[PDB]
């Protein structure tokens, strides 16, 4: 069975290029492979190797092999477990060519983080392919979509990356962009970045988001306008961000005192806004 497996393995591995397949890669390679009981249970690297071969082969075309016709004519006693091994190593091959950026060929996936592949899957135009990738990753890589997605979302939220969040959440996560922004907000230091995060995520999290979240984005923009009014009326970025991150306890009066002949009109307008 191992030698007939290898006969198929030759016929295929040789078909793996552009050479014309002679007679047998269309009937004799198939017969030799059918003679292979490379079975289930703990086996050598050959079983999973040929399993991935047929599967990642089903990820190809042009010559006469795949996991597809393989499954067609390869249902036997010593094969369903090898099929499961093919599932594991096939999740491996599809992650191997991970979400294919044919348009974006400049990005090198030699040492790339999972964020790029995950975002490409989310914003992919193939919910069938996207769902297949997610299910395979869960089954044979132990990764729920939600947990990894939310961890990466908090990670991106701490840094306030507006437009990319608006783009990737537009795949499915428009509802929770404002919530992610709120979770990461206490980890922010620049007013422009905060406004950008609210606009391209929290405002991008529009009607699909919770009313409280978009309301918080609006109140935050209003407070930012009031603070700009005060800053025009009047800078320690340390004290500013200390008040901002601590605004929950830091009273507005606390922050302002922390900041006679000045513009009582400007502060009066800032207060009358409230």
């Amino acid at each position: 069975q191992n030698a007939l497996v290898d006969l198929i393995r030759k016929a295929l591995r040789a078909l793996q290029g552009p050479d014309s397949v002679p007679p047998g890669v269309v009937d004799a390679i198939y017969g030799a492979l059918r003679t292979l009981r490379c079975p289930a249970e703990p086996l050598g690297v050959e079983l999973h190797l040929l399993c991935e071969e047929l599967l990642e082969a089903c990820r190809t075309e042009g010559s006469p092999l795949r996991e597809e016709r393989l499954l067609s004519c390869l249902l036997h006693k010593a094969s369903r477990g090898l099929l499961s091994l093919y599932g594991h190593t096939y999740a491996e091959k599809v992650t191997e060519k991970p979400p294919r950026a044919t348009a974006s060929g400049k990005v090198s996936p030699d040492h790339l983080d999972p964020e790029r592949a995950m975002l490409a899957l989310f914003s992919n135009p193939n919910p069938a392919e996207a769902w297949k990738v997610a299910y395979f990753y869960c089954l044979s890589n132990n990764k729920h979509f939600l947990e990894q997605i939310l961890v990466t979302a908090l990670t991106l939220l701490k840094e306030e990356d507006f437009p990319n969040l608006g783009c990737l959440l537009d795949r499915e996560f428009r509802p929770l962009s404002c919530l992610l922004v709120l979770l990461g907000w206490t980890h922010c230091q620049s007013l422009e970045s905060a406004k950008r995060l609210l606009q391209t995520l929290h405002r991008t999290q529009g009607p699909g988001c919770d009313e409280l979240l978009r309301d918080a984005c609006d109140g935050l923009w209003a407070h930012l306008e009031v603070l700009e009014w005060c800053i025009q009326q009047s800078i320690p970025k340390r004290d500013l961000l200390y008040h901002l991150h601590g605004g929950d306890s830091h009273s507005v009066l606390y922050t302002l005192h922390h900041l006679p002949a000045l513009r009582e009109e400007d502060v009066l307008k800032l207060l009358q806004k409230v």
Binding site: E67, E68, L71, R80, L83, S84, G87, P127, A128, W131, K132, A134, Y135, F136, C138, L139, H144, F145, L146, E147, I149, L150, V151, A153, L154, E172, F173, P175, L176, L179, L182, L183, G184, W185, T186, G208, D210, E211, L212, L213, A216, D248, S249, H250, S251, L253, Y254, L256, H257, L259, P260
Partner: protein, 191 residues
Amino acid sequence: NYKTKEGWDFHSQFILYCLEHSLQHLLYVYLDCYKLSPENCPFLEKKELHEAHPWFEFLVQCRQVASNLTDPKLIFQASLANAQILIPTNQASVSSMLLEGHTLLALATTMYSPGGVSQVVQNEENENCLKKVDPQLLKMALTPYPKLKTALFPQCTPPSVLPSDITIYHLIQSLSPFDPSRLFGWQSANT
């Protein structure tokens, strides 16, 4: 021109044996060969088998939501199936990770699901069992979520004033020698 007395088919048995082979994407290829759908096959929705073969329920929800994942309904069904497959709880959902502390997956599942986040913020009477969670386990287990906790649920404080982090002497001290601490000790507001 084939049939039985019992009622199975070599294709009925074919899908059943693919389950006996525990196939999801290969079973999905076979389903496309039959061009399968969210509920077009009444015999593929065995809740006992769906959870028990959590992979099979994941594949069925995959067909349903690859047909339509944008909808909160079909997408919510797919997310619940994914939680059942991943979280091994007999009742595995957003709540399973929530009570355990993993409120991240909880919010991710609750963004577009029955009841809703603001509804949970207000109303907890939604008879849908998937719209509830163990309260204290998740709550104390939501420790790394101060900002999230503040944003999600308004604080049900009484009519008494909340913390006022500026004092009369204090805010006055912004005028340098005009810090009212040097006198007026009988007034606490000038703290």
